Amino acid sequence: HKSEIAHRFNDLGEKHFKGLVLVAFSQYLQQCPFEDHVKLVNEVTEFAKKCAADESAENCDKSLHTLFGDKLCTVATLRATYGELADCCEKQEPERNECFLTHKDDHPNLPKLKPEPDAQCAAFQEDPDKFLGKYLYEVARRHPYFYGPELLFHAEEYKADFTECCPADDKLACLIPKLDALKERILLSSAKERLKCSSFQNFGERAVKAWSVARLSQKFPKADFAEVSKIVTDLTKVHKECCHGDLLECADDRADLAKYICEHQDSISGKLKACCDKPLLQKSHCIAEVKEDDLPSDLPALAADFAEDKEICKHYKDAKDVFLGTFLYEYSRRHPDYSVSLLLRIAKTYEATLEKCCAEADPPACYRTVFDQFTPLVEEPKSLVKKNCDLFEEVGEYDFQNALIVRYTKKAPQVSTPTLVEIGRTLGKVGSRCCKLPESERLPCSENHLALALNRLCVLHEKTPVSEKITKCCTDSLAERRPCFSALELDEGYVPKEFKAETFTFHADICTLPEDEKQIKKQSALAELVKHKPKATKEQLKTVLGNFSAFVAKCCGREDKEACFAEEGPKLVASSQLALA
Numbered sequence: 001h002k003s004e005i006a007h008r009f010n011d012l013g014e015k016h017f018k019g020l021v022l023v024a025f026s027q028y029l030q031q032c033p034f035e036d037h038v039k040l041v042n043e044v045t046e047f048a049k050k051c052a053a054d055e056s057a058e059n060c061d062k063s064l065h066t067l068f069g070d071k072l073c074t075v076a077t078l079r080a081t082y083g084e085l086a087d088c089c090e091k092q093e094p095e096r097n098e099c100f101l102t103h104k105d106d107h108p109n110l111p112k113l114k115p116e117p118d119a120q121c122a123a124f125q126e127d128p129d130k131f132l133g134k135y136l137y138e139v140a141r142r143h144p145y146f147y148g149p150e151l152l153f154h155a156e157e158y159k160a161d162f163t164e165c166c167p168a169d170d171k172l173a174c175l176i177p178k179l180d181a182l183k184e185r186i187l188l189s190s191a192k193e194r195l196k197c198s199s200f201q202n203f204g205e206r207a208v209k210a211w212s213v214a215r216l217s218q219k220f221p222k223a224d225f226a227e228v229s230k231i232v233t234d235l236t237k238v239h240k241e242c243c244h245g246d247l248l249e250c251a252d253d254r255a256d257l258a259k260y261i262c263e264h265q266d267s268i269s270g271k272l273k274a275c276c277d278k279p280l281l282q283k284s285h286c287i288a289e290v291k292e293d294d295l296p297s298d299l300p301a302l303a304a305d306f307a308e309d310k311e312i313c314k315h316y317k318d319a320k321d322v323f324l325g326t327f328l329y330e331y332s333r334r335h336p337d338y339s340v341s342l343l344l345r346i347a348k349t350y351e352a353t354l355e356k357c358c359a360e361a362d363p364p365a366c367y368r369t370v371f372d373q374f375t376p377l378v379e380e381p382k383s384l385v386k387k388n389c390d391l392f393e394e395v396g397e398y399d400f401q402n403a404l405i406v407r408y409t410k411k412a413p414q415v416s417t418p419t420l421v422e423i424g425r426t427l428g429k430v431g432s433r434c435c436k437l438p439e440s441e442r443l444p445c446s447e448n449h450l451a452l453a454l455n456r457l458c459v460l461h462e463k464t465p466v467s468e469k470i471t472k473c474c475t476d477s478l479a480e481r482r483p484c485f486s487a488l489e490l491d492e493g494y495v496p497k498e499f500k501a502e503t504f505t506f507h508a509d510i511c512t513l514p515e516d517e518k519q520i521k522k523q524s525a526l527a528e529l530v531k532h533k534p535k536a537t538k539e540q541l542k543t544v545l546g547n548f549s550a551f552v553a554k555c556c557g558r559e560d561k562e563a564c565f566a567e568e569g570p571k572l573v574a575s576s577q578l579a580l581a
């Protein structure tokens with residue numbers, strides 16, 4: 001392949017190629033107007049066609065990286081709008097892209113994209129191409145590590161929704177449920193993918209493969225070890241390319257993998273057939289989301305091979321990584337009911353046990369009981385989910401979020417209020433989604449979702465580190481991350497944040513906010529109450545918040561809203577203090 005970009009263009013097709021370039025640019029250059037991005041995509045795409053037709057043309061042999069980078073450095077507003085991102089252009093590859101990646105913004109704080117059915121159907125009417133391009137543009141800029149080929153797929157869902165619902169008399173009736181569900185799907189996928197990219201960055205490729213050996217062994221328990229390994233090797237390569245911004249290569253390799261999975265579905269899983277009848281993007285998504293296959297009925301006990309066999313230290317000496325990979329695959333396929341981290345924790349203990357045991361002068365004797373060690377590990381997660389789902393089913397979502405906001409704020413009161421509020425809200429929604437699920441599916445859902453929320457917190461906290469405890473938990477070890485967070489507790493040495501009346505002062509402009517923005521303001525007040533009076537109980541904190549909430553509702557219902565806030569406000573701010581002693 002003389003020319004990489006011809007090759008990409010040839011393999012991907014003009015539409016998706018175009019689509020991926022729009023996405024890539026929107027992730028790198030998050031503020032630029034949609035129109036500026038359209039032009040860039042068109043330029044790159046032109047040059048691609050020149051090359052596909054003639055690979056000797058000036059510059060067609062340069063790497064995609066180099067071509068994209070040079071293109072980014074061309075932007076007329078780069079310095080003006082993106083500032084020090086412009087300094088990256090002085091660097092050379094591969095450092096240039098590294099430098100660009102660091103400057104992707106994980107908290108871009110763009111206006112909340114909400115469904116406006118009368119509005120959007122008519123935008124869908126006025127110009128559709130701009131409409132489906134904009135969607136990709138808006139999602140990409142808000143989620144700078146979003147999984148390239150998956151975004152193009154959600155766009156199609158987006159198109160299919162509008163095309164169906166905009167003709168009916170009752171567009172909103174049809175439309176809103178659909179868009180609401182799609183926002184949720186986007187959030188979850190973006191969090192899933194950010195965790196992969198975070199793992200590459202902080203723990204490396206090894207950690208990403210183990211995580212993936214576990215997950216895929218659970219999904220495809222029927223598959224033998226060499227399949228799993230092959231698929232995992234290819235999928236890691238794919239996600240590494242996407243996390244680094246190489247969306248064309250990412251996508252091209254992803255189509256190859258989807259092809260491979262579909263040509264070997266008999267040897268992988270029986271739940272693949274419907275997926276493998278689909279067009280490309282649908283097919284890849286369908287595979288990404290496939291239900292776990294049924295446990296096979298011919299699997300032996302793991303003891304024989306992993307506790308009883310007397311040459312185990314021998315094997316473990318010769319092929320450490322391989323042999324432990326074999327343990328992880330075997331253990332994970334038997335346990336479709338465990339979170340990926342729990343599995344990884346288990347594997348780490350096994351590895352640790354062998355190194356301990358294999359120095360002792362009779363290793364069979366001790367590692368004989370290695371499986372006893374996994375009991376307490378399995379049990380802890382089971383307790384946390386039961387503790388949380390119990391609280392959730394009792395008090396409802398909003399109260400659950402509140403209880404989590406308080407709990408996390410006590411653990412890490414230095415962390416910003418916007419971040420504390422976000423994790424707590426996110427974790428409340430996990431309660432709604434996960435708790436109603438069968439126990440075989442509840443542990444994994446809440447713990448796999450919890451992993452994603454902790455990662456988000458660590459991503460935000462790494463932008464501007466403020467708590468050492470948090471850094472330690474975020475950077476020590478992916479498998480121990482949840483236990484590390486669970487162990488955090490209010491430090492005896494924490495100095496309360498000094499009181500600031502303004503921080504608890506509300507005004508009428510809250511009345512015109514969306515409900516969820518209303519709750520965010522209230523929930524932010526909650527976190528600050530905790531920062532100022534950290535020793536206050538959750539029950540005292542719930543009462544004070546109830547009083548602010550009753551105050552806001554009333555004043556927002558008043559004829560003279562502003563007079564109500566002005567008179568009533570200071571009374572609350574005063575009494576709040578004493579209520580939290």
Ligand SMILES: [Br-]
Nearest residue numbers: 044047067071
């Ligand atoms: Br170009």
Ligand SMILES: [Br-]
Nearest residue numbers: 143144145146
């Ligand atoms: Br993202």
Ligand SMILES: [Br-]
Nearest residue numbers: 246247248249
């Ligand atoms: Br690329």
Ligand SMILES: [Br-]
Nearest residue numbers: 149254255284
């Ligand atoms: Br794909």
Ligand SMILES: [Br-]
Nearest residue numbers: 263264266267
């Ligand atoms: Br096969």
Ligand SMILES: [Br-]
Nearest residue numbers: 412413414467
């Ligand atoms: Br802290």
Ligand SMILES: [Br-]
Nearest residue numbers: 191452453456
């Ligand atoms: Br999250």
Ligand SMILES: [Br-]
Nearest residue numbers: 415416419461
């Ligand atoms: Br933070």
Ligand SMILES: [Br-]
Nearest residue numbers: 384485486487
């Ligand atoms: Br916890």
Ligand SMILES: [Br-]
Nearest residue numbers: 507508562565
């Ligand atoms: Br006011």
Ligand SMILES: [Br-]
Nearest residue numbers: 544547575576
């Ligand atoms: Br109060």
